[PDB]
Amino acid sequence: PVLDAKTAALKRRSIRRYRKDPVPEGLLREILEAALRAPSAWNLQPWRIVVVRDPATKRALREAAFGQAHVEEAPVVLVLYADLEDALAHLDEVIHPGVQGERREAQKQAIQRAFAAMGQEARKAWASGQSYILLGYLLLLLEAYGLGSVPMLGFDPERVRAILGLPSRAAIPALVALGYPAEEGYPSHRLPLERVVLWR
């Protein structure tokens, strides 16, 4: 009974306490397959995910996340990383299958030229930005399936790269702890609509 998207967005709160029940791999795969349909500029999809269930690795990530207890307690921690260089080395995988021959090359050169003119920090920030569209899809879908989650930026990226063996060029836009909820979550407010939106 997956929830409608409006109820999911209005009811979500971050959850930091979880039941001890495992999350079935079949259920996780259905959620990730739907979240990976998120759109990105030029269909580049620079996002990459590590699903961490091993207890020793979760304990190591808890230390990298300044001791946040939910990293170790949740049944599953997702590491969302962005690898622009892996995307650019495999551009034929993201170009539309109908766009072939000479059209494919012109699209591929325009993309390579745009990124050849950018530094390492700018590339990481661009690929991280696109990865946050996928994060928005994933948080709404986790709520719609009845799972709780907390996205995190409070961690040392150098330690996370070392524990998992990630490339030095990768950016890590978030860790996400998830599982079946054992708490309601705290009420949080948002700015009034009229403070954020201007009508023209």
Instruction: Provide the mask over 147-166, with x wherever binding to ligand FMN is found by CB under 6 A and - wherever it is not.
Output: ---xxxxx------------
- Binding to a copy of itself by CB under 8 A, coded x per residue (else -) over 123-152, reads --xx-xxx-xxxxxx-xxx-xxx-----x-
Q: Which residues have a Cβ under 8 Å from the Cβ of 46 and sit 6 or more positions away?
A: 40, 82, 83, 84, 86, 87, 127, 130, 131
Considering only 14, 57, 72, 163, the residue that binds ligand FMN (CB under 6 A) is: 14
The interface partner of residue 17, options being ligand FMN, a copy of itself, none and the CB cut-off 5 to 8 Å by kind, is none
Indicate the SS3 state at residue 162. helix
185 binds, among ligand FMN, a copy of itself, none (CB under 5 to 8 A by kind): ligand FMN
- Measured from the CB of residue 13, what is the shortest distance to ligand FMN in angstroms? 4
Contact between 43 and ligand FMN by CB under 6 A: the answer reads: yes
- Among 41, 69, 89, 106, the residue binding a copy of itself under the rule CB under 8 A is 41
Residue 16 is assigned to a ligand binding site: yes
For residue 52, the cross-strand partners are 77
Question: Does 13 count as an annotated binding residue?
Answer: yes
φ/ψ (deg, to 5) at 147: -100, 150
Question: How many CB atoms lie under 10 A from the CB of residue 54?
Answer: 10
108 contacts a copy of itself (rule: CB under 8 A): no
Q: Which of 132, 171, 108 is nearest to 116 (CA)?
A: 108
Is 12 a known ligand-binding residue? yes
Other C-beta atoms lying within 10 Å of the C-beta of residue 75:
18
The answer to whether the Cα torsion of 137, 90, 169, 120 is positive or negative is negative
Please tell me the distance from the alpha carbon of residue 66 to that of residue 68, in angstroms, as a whole number.
6
Encoded one letter per residue, x for contact with ligand FMN by CB under 6 A and - for no contact, window 116-135 reads: -----------------x--
Task: By CB under 6 A, name the binding residues for ligand FMN.
Answer: 13-14, 39-43, 68, 133, 150-154, 174, 185, 188
